[PDB]
Structure formats: structure tokens, C-alpha cells
Amino acid sequence: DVKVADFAYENYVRNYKEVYEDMMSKSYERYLIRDEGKVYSYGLHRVCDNCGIRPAVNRSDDGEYLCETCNLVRDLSKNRGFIAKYKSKYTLYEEQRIEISPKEDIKFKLDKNQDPTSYAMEIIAGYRTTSDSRYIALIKADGNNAGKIFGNTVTFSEYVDKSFRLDFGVKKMFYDTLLDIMRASSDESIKKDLVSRILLGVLYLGG
RNA sequence: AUUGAAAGUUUUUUUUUUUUUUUUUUUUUUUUUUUUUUUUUUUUUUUU
């Protein structure tokens, strides 16, 4: 959904509140739609009947659990995604640059015939071996009353500064927490593995 | 005749072991079985 509002004039730049007002005003256009006829498999399962002109739900290597859209997304993610993060080498540039190689830091002993992407959730959880029971936690954070706070902004520059400060401070907090974990006065292998697992278990951070 | 279905949250684990209601505590301290009462009264060592 594309929302466009006038940004600034020749001798005047509008404050964030008015711009957001214009954006929200030009939002009814989203709710206008027209009629279309198609078929999309409910989720990605089974072989429905519906209209039979097209071929059925494509078969999968594991059997029959692959819809076309999910098939395409899986094809896209086969090369890049979590596996790319695992096969990377993150470096923490500080007074002593320290690198992290999950391919060499995770202590999950797997046979060469096993797929790390399949056991990605277990790896992030912390299964050092397949015969391990261990829960994994999810952390979601969000700012408080951000919308009205940005509404009560004197100038657009103030809004930009506040957003930049928020994002950079969030990233700084995460980095400092990682540094604190790194400086734990314990064996470097343990902290390296923990940092690798934490880094792998990140979906999106910022703002 | 629900998009549509058929699966026991089940098996398995003794709230058990250690610990003496025990030590100390004399039913004794005191009190004369005495106290008033005469073994007394009557009777001729004696006759034909």
C-alpha cells in the first residue's frame, strides 16, 4: 500500500503531524477493491478440487505438502536465509576484533547426511546433541506510545533525530549486551557458542 | 452428512533415612500410752 503526501514547500517544510494526518486521510483508497475470481490453496495442504483447468497442488519431495507459492518461497530460501547466516562469519570490531563462525562455534554434532536448516530451530534452542531436551524463548519488544509522541513533534528534523536516536540506541544496547556476554571470565568456547546461537536467533532488530 | 477423519497425555518412580521425653528430687519435721484406785472386811486354836 503506497501512501504519498506533500513533503515540503519552497519556503516551508511541514511538521510530521500534518504529514501523518495527510497520510491517514488518504487511506480510504486501500479499502476500495474489485471482484476477482481465482483459486489459492488454503494454506499449502492437500489436493482440493475447485476449478480443474489448472494442474493440482504440486507434489513435494516429502510427499504432498507444497503449494505453488510456498514452493516458490522455499526455492528462494534454499540458497539464502538462515543457512546463509549460519555459513557466515560475524566480526565484532572493538579494542580487540573478535570473529564468530557458527560453522565452527555451534557444538551440535550432526552427521554429514543431516541438514542444519531442518534442525535450525533446535540449533537456536541449544541442542548440543540430538538426544537433548531444551526450550527456546521468543523476545519481542516495542516502544511505548510512539505514535502520539511523534505526533507531538515540533519539526520534522526533531522527528528524524528521535527516530535515529531510537534505532541507534537499540542497536547499541544489543551490541553492548553481546559484549557483556563475551566478557564473562569463562571458557571462550562457551561464550562463542552462546553468541553464535543468539545471533542466529535474530529475526529483525531496529526501531 | 462440518474442508474432515482417528488417535487415553499415557506410561514408569514407596515421602524414605538419622533421634530412648531424658538428667536431677529420701512423703519427713515435731508429740513420754498417762491419770485418779490400800488385795480390803467378816472368823476366840479350839470340847465329853
From TrEMBL:
It comes from Saccharolobus solfataricus (Sulfolobus solfataricus). Coiled coil: none annotated. This is CRISPR-associated protein Cas10 (Type III-D). Transmembrane segments: none annotated. The chain holds residues 422 to 628 of 835 of the full protein. It comes from the Archaea.
